[PDB]
Design an enzyme around this catalytic site. Sequence first.
Site, mmCIF file in Angstrom:
data_model
loop_
_atom_site.group_PDB
_atom_site.id
_atom_site.type_symbol
_atom_site.label_atom_id
_atom_site.label_comp_id
_atom_site.label_asym_id
_atom_site.label_seq_id
_atom_site.Cartn_x
_atom_site.Cartn_y
_atom_site.Cartn_z
ATOM 1 N N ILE B 20 -17.561 -18.284 -17.201
ATOM 2 C CA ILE B 20 -16.918 -16.979 -17.267
ATOM 3 C C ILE B 20 -15.699 -16.975 -16.359
ATOM 4 O O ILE B 20 -15.102 -15.929 -16.104
ATOM 5 C CB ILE B 20 -17.876 -15.860 -16.813
ATOM 6 C CG1 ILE B 20 -18.326 -16.095 -15.370
ATOM 7 C CG2 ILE B 20 -19.082 -15.779 -17.736
ATOM 8 C CD1 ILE B 20 -19.315 -15.074 -14.861
ATOM 9 N N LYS B 22 -11.986 -18.249 -15.581
ATOM 10 C CA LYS B 22 -10.655 -18.807 -15.775
ATOM 11 C C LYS B 22 -10.115 -19.227 -14.408
ATOM 12 O O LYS B 22 -10.289 -20.372 -13.985
ATOM 13 C CB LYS B 22 -9.733 -17.765 -16.412
ATOM 14 C CG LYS B 22 -9.883 -16.368 -15.817
ATOM 15 C CD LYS B 22 -8.563 -15.614 -15.825
ATOM 16 C CE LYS B 22 -8.593 -14.435 -14.863
ATOM 17 N NZ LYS B 22 -9.688 -13.479 -15.184
ATOM 18 N N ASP B 134 -5.881 -13.710 -0.164
ATOM 19 C CA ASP B 134 -5.686 -13.304 -1.555
ATOM 20 C C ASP B 134 -6.473 -12.051 -1.929
ATOM 21 O O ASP B 134 -7.470 -12.127 -2.648
ATOM 22 C CB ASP B 134 -6.075 -14.443 -2.498
ATOM 23 C CG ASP B 134 -5.935 -14.064 -3.959
ATOM 24 O OD1 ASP B 134 -4.901 -13.463 -4.316
ATOM 25 O OD2 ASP B 134 -6.857 -14.368 -4.748
#
Lengths: 313, 265
Positions: B20, B22, B134
């Site tokens: 699931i 990317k 991030d």
Amino acid sequence: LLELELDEQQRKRLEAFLTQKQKVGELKDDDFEKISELGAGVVFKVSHKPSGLVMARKLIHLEIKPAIRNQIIRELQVLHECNSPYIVGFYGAFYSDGEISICMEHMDGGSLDQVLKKAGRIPEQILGKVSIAVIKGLTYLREKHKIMHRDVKPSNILVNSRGEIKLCDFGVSGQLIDSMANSFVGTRSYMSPERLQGTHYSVQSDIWSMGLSLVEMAVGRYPIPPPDAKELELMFGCPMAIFELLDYIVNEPPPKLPSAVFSLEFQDFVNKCLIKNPAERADLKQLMVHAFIKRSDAEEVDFAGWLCSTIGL
Amino acid sequence: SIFLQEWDIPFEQLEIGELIGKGRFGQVYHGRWHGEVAIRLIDIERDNEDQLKAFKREVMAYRQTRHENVVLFMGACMSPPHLAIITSLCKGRTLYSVVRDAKIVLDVNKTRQIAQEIVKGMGYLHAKGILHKDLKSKNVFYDKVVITDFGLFSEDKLRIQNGWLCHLAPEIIRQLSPDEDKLPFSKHSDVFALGTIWYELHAREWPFKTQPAEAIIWQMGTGMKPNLSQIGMGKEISDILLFCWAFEQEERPTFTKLMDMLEKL
Ligand SMILES: Nc1ncnc2c1ncn2[C@@H]1O[C@H](COP(=O)(O)OP(=O)(O)OP(=O)(O)O)[C@@H](O)[C@H]1O
Ligand SMILES: Nc1ncnc2c1ncn2[C@@H]1O[C@H](COP(=O)(O)OP(=O)(O)OP(=O)(O)O)[C@@H](O)[C@H]1O
Ligand SMILES: [Cl-]
Ligand SMILES: [Mg+2]
Ligand SMILES: [Mg+2]
């Protein structure tokens, strides 16, 4: 149904492109037989078995669901009517389990980017033909499709052994650029100074690109930053932060063709492209009738001749 | 060189599920650390046998962290070849997706609440002295509100992804082409990134929604913060937005002072 103003010989070449295109129906991934790699930023010099031909093919990773691809291909289909002596004619577009594959004409001479590497510096006499072809190309797009290139690089000006010059990699698929945003930046830019700031990018934006690219063509080096004092001193014969490069493009004066080594006519040309202010910059008209363009158009040049006398083939 | 046993959470059987993930860093699988967790496989890069402080001191410190606004760090394990990080599977929607979900009310108070949490979590990680770096919108989940994927920084001519570029404070946005870690990531780096998420909350889209990469870089580089007042806008909100984006990383609020403002309305 046709077009205005076409060379007798080009009318021959382009006519063959059509007859040879009617030979290919759908687009089977199996029909294509991978041959040799070309570039990336990926293109392969593959061959179509059924039509027994060799066409150039590009494709890049795209895990987009089936729902999306159908629209992308739809917009991509527009490429069909986009046929010109100054444009790399294409064939079709299709998926591949997880990637879009664009099929187009194979310019064996490669993009001017490659040629500029295997030649060091490109002769002005030639850049004239190039400039012309480019201008007519961009002119053709805007006039006949309202479409502007949006991405003009030396790596996008294909040139085959026919002494032909055609453009490629020009944005035609709107929805595609959505997923195709968020990508490689690099260390060499072509964004016109107005864009970096926000101003809508007119067709004059591509002009700046062309202008900038042209300069890189002659001096054989990405103009910015302009050569030192001993750098340019030793160039005639025969490491930055991304934001800094950009900030320079915006505030500092543009690149200039080294005087003496180039005609003043030509200098004025590139100069008319690199005018940092959009409105004040030359339009595709001024350029089409500029002293430099007028000259090179009549300048007898064995293009394909010397062409295959530098990269061979 | 780290094994799942060195972790609090009892592990015996860990089974992977359907992919699931990317993402940039590794792939994320809907796995099962006995329970329902999310496994990220960041297959190690060759050599580099000199990264002790990088994990022999870092990742292991993610143990002894536990907050209601932070994803549970189940633990990781560095093998010779591969690497895998486990983490509580968030059974909800990413803030990114919901902030764009086909019309959801979300007031300005429902907005304040979202921001309340994000800063509570970031504050926690602050005290523990651990930088998020991030803090995207796509890295917040809605079960309540949970932060995730903090401290994940361990490929030829700079590949800039989506709206990531519009979360990097000025200090950072001046980036090399090669160089991806070891930037001016400060604790202010994070507070800045939060600002952009806030704009996102109110504008239901993130800044520079249309500009190219080079444009953002130069614009955000010259410190060109996008509009604030656009019918409908609202004072108060407009103010805090600038503070988070202050060009000088010093002039920016600390998560604990920002939480205070956040509660004033
Ligand atoms: N149809 C084609 N025929 C011959 N060569 C091609 C063709 N298309 C691409 N190439 C080669 O591929 C190289 C560029 O590939 P690609 O288009 O993937 O990247 P780019 O054009 O440099 O970057 P961008 O795609 O962002 O413009 C050029 O050097 C060119 O010679
Ligand atoms: N802790 C988690 N809990 C639930 N889902 C997760 C978790 N971590 C990742 N995911 C899922 O993985 C997908 C993306 O993986 P990853 O976190 O690597 O990238 P991202 O969050 O989309 O950020 P980016 O793609 O910018 O790296 C998201 O769709 C998300 O739903
Ligand atoms: Cl004009
Ligand atoms: Mg190309
Ligand atoms: Mg993530």
